[PDB]
Amino acid sequence: TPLTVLLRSVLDQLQDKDPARIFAQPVSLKEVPDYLDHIKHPMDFATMRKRLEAQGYKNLHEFEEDFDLIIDNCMKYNARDTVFYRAAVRLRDQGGVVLRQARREVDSIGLEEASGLEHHHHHH
């Protein structure tokens, strides 16, 4: 469907803002045993991918909410002076540009035309 196509393109670009794959898979309790003491709703790109594949996002807003979980959880759990926190800040800022442009396109030119534009932009 057009919505899956749009969200797939957006998710691919969001992951490009995470080149070291810090957010690509769930945080492991084996490596981070106290994670769930601070984070109640873990989220990661692979989990968003699965939800996408199954048409589990009603619209862009629900998709943004999952992206926000990835960001907010990382800035909550990890202290400011860490590699994880800084990577979350870059993903928040760089991905926010992507998300606001995608919403802007859907609202102005329609979902199909936005999915077409998101599959290959001519500029950024």
Swiss-Prot record:
UniProt superkingdom: Eukaryota
Description of how the protein assembles with itself and partners: Component of some HBO1 complex composed of KAT7/HBO1, MEAF6, ING4 and BRD1/BRPF2. Component of the MOZ/MORF complex composed at least of ING5, KAT6A, KAT6B, MEAF6 and one of BRPF1, BRD1/BRPF2 and BRPF3. Interacts (via PHD-type zinc finger domain) with unmodified histone H3. Interacts (via PWWP domain) with dimethylated and trimethylated 'Lys-79' on histone H3.
Tissue expression summary: Highly expressed in testis.
Biological role stated in the UniProt entry: Scaffold subunit of various histone acetyltransferase (HAT) complexes, such as the MOZ/MORF and HBO1 complexes, that acts as a regulator of hematopoiesis. Plays a key role in HBO1 complex by directing KAT7/HBO1 specificity towards histone H3 'Lys-14' acetylation (H3K14ac), thereby promoting erythroid differentiation.
Positions of crosslink type Glycyl lysine isopeptide (Lys-Gly) (interchain with G-Cter in SUMO2): K30
Residues annotated as domain Bromo: 1-102
Entry protein name: Bromodomain-containing protein 1
Compartments it resides in: Nucleus; Chromosome
